[PDB]
Structure formats: structure tokens, C-alpha cells
Ligand SMILES: O=C(CO)[C@@H](O)[C@H](O)[C@H](O)CO
């Protein structure tokens with residue numbers, strides 16, 4: 001059956017924060033998974049990586065990692081120095097993941113994010129470098145039983161993989177057993193003709209699903225077709241990870257990277273965000289036919 005998570009960034013204005021409080025929180029909320037930022041792991045002291053692994057084991061919580069590579073670590077760059085620096089950086093992230101007991105890394109691990117359209121790009125050249133880089137990283141990942149999740153993003157955030165057709169073509173070309181597609185309701189809602197059809201199309205390639213409303217509020221506060229999404233997951237016999245990715249806070253690096261320029265929380269306290277996420281999880285489980 002499916003396992004449910006949340007991204008810690010629901011509560012935070014920064015990517016690089018302590019994650020321990022969120023392991024205890026997701027256990028209290030009856031979630032199966034905490035997704036953490038790779039940027040909070042890569043330079044974390046060894047003792048704190050071990051403490052995070054032990055706390056997750058104590059609470060029987062699965063940890064996953066999210067990443068959007070910065071421009072200086074663009075593994076799709078036509079600049080060999082940038083490409084190599086990005087590969088060095090993701091290998092360090094994977095080393096830290098291993099110490100924290102983390103096996104899944106998803107997001108823009110295959111290019112840079114958020115994309116900057118102020119300068120030119122070469123989509124074919126970037127795609128070719130991206131595939132070569134991801135194959136090298138997939139091979140490195142095997143020693144730690146790590147899976148790479150290639151996220152399909154809207155046109156404003158990236159240019160390489162904007163729909164399930166492009167992401168499936170890319171992942172089939174990469175041709176590595178530990179490289180899979182990640183779909184995201186926010187992104188699918190912009191680029192797909194029909195969200196449930198995109199999930200069915202992706203099928204066996206779907207390694208993880210991010211969920212949120214169209215404006216990234218918690219599920220139940222918007223208009224997403226939750227029953228149709230649930231049916232599509234049944235149609236492909238999905239028993240994988242469903243991670244809530246709500247972004248309702250303006251400010252900090254998180255608000256600037258997600259481009260949220262107004263409060264969507266009604267100035268909610270942390271306690272109110274907890275209550276709304278619990279309500280949302282019950283709503284999602286009901287819509288998905290749990
Ligand atoms: O959907 C998004 C970005 O719009 C997130 O899942 C992001 O890609 C991940 O946090 C890695 O940065």
C-alpha cells in the first residue's frame with residue numbers, strides 16, 4: 001500500500017535547517033516519510049547524520065531527499081568544469097545520504113533549478129550532457145542502493161522535461177534501473193492535458209509523486225482532481241511514495257525559489273499548519289480509497 005510523506009520546507013523559510021524536529025513531527029502526524037533538503041545534509045557533521053538516521057529508525061520514519069542543483073553545479077552545462085563540479089557535489093550529497101540512511105533523491109538532480117531565462121540555452125546540448133551526467137551518478141548511486149527521481153517541472157522552472165512524455169523519453173534513454181520519473185501535481189496541472197492520464201502514461205516509470213493544490217496549498221484547499229488522481233494510482237498499481245509538498249509561506253530562500261510573493265497561510269502558526277496537514281492527509285487518504 002502507499003506510503004505518505006511531507007517535505008519539511010512546509011514549515012521553513014530556508015533549505016539548510018536541522019531536520020530532527022521534523023522526524024518527531026511526522027511521526028506525531030502519522031506520516032510514513034519525511035523528505036529533507038539535500039542542501040541540509042551535504043555539509044552536516046557525521047555525528048548529526050548518524051543521529052538523524054538513528055532518530056528515523058527509532059520512530060520507524062523513512063527519510064527521502066529533495067534537491068534543486070544551483071547553477072554552479074549544473075550537470076547539464078556545456079561548461080565541462082561546471083558539469084564536473086556538479087557531479088562532484090551530487091556524489092558528496094549521496095555520501096551524506098548513505099550516512100543518514102537515505103535511499104531516494106529527487107528533484108532537479110539532472111540540470112539546475114530554478115532556471116534563469118535571462119541568458120541563452122541549448123536544449124538539445126543540455127539534454128545530451130544531462131543524460132551522460134545522470135548515467136554517471138546512477139552508477140555511483142548503486143554502492144548505496146540509491147534511486148534518482150527525475151522530476152517533471154513546469155516551463156517556468158526548467159526547459160528540459162516539462163511533461164510526462166518528455167520525462168518518460170528521457171528516463172528510457174538514460175536506461176538505468178535506479179533512475180525513475182517523479183511527477184508533481186503542481187507541475188502536471190500546468191503542462192499536462194489531463195493529470196490522471198499523465199500518471200497512467202508514466203506507469204512503471206513512476207518512482208515518486210509530489211502532491212499539492214494548484215497554488216501549492218495543502219490538498220483539500222483547492223480544486224485538484226484528487227479522486228481521478230487516486231484512480232490513476234490504482235490503475236498503475238502504485239504502492240510507492242506520495243509526498244505532500246505544500247508551500248504557503250512568503251520570505252526566505254524558500255519563498256524566493258518557489259516565487260511566492262503573498263502569504264497563502266492566513267498567517268498560520270506552526271500548530272495550525274500541523275492541524276491543516278493532518279486534516280489534508282485524512283482527506284487525501286479518503287480520496288485515494290485507503
Ligand atoms: O516541485 C518542486 C519545485 O517546484 C520541488 O519538488 C523541488 O523540485 C524539490 O524540492 C527539489 O528542489
Ligand SMILES: [Co+2]
Nearest residue numbers: 151184210245
Ligand atoms: Co515537486
